[PDB]
Design a protein around this ligand. Structure first.
Ligand SMILES: CCCCCCCCCCCCCCCCC[C@@H](O)O[C@H](CO[C@H](O)CCCCCCCCCCCCCCC)COP(=O)(O)OCC[N+](C)(C)C
Ligand SMILES: CCCCCCCC/C=C\CCCCCCCC(=O)O[C@H](COC(=O)CCCCCCC/C=C/CCCCCCCC)COP(=O)(O)OCCN
Lengths: 83, 69
């Protein structure tokens, strides 16, 4: 932990570009695992309706499937509006 | 000499019969196996010569953005 300080000092004195590149790359690898917004990005990607939602044939045993888009059932995107 | 070194003829006789039975059974088994192999290769209905086919578990049975698949 003491010699690494001298090594970093020498690298910064001689090769600032390499030090900057390595720092930026290391941040790029490690930061996304520690961020709480990557889940939000995944859900935003999942909430984009590229495809037509094919309706389900009613059998009388779906309490959680809406009959109309304005019905309270189904997923809600209110989290996206406030995001 | 016969008592000390040799046996009776019955022993050799019956050993010969046992050997003959084993060899005849082996011959008939070999011929039957050849016929079975020929039939299985010709028809393909047996356990042998079952060449692989595409697994139907890979098919996706979901709506395909188009009603006509
Ligand atoms: C009264 C006699 C007067 C006349 C004498 C005649 C002399 C004849 C003797 C010469 C013998 C010829 C050799 C043939 C040996 C046959 C070997 C084999 O076939 O026999 C075995 C039998 O084993 C015998 O013990 C064989 C022993 C003979 C060994 C020969 C060695 C002689 C060499 C001596 C050289 C000198 C040594 C000193 C060096 C300085 C079979 O084993 P096994 O499956 O169980 O028995 C089946 C039959 N039963 C079940 C009924 C018993
Ligand atoms: C974990 C992240 C990894 C991914 C990020 C990296 C992104 C891209 C960067 C890498 C590109 C290729 C690497 C280049 C390797 C060069 C090594 C070399 O031999 O060059 C040396 C020069 O560099 C060196 O001296 C060796 C390494 C020097 C330091 C390099 C980085 C070491 C670590 C720095 C960062 C540490 C961690 C981040 C903390 C930063 C501090 C806050 C020789 O110089 P020359 O040009 O050949 O001589 C001509 C002049 N006579």
């Amino acid at each position: 932990a003491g010699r690494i300080a001298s090594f970093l000092k020498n690298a910064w004195a001689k090769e600032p570009v390499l030090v900057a590149s390595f720092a930026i790359g290391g941040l790029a690898i490690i930061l996304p695992s520690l961020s709480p917004y990557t889940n939000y990005a995944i859900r935003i990607n999942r909430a984009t309706p590229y495809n037509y939602p094919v309706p389900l044939r009613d059998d009388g045993n779906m309490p959680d499937v809406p009959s109309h888009p304005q019905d309270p059932q189904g997923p809600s995107l209110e989290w996206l509006k406030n995001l | 000499i016969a008592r000390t070194f040799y046996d009776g003829p019955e022993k050799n006789y019956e050993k010969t019969m046992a050997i003959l039975q084993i060899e005849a059974e082996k011959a008939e088994l070999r011929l039957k196996e050849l016929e079975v192999r020929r039939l299985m290769r010709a028809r393909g209905d047996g356990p042998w010569y079952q060449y692989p086919t595409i697994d139907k578990a890979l098919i996706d049975h979901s709506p395909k953005t188009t009603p006509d698949n």
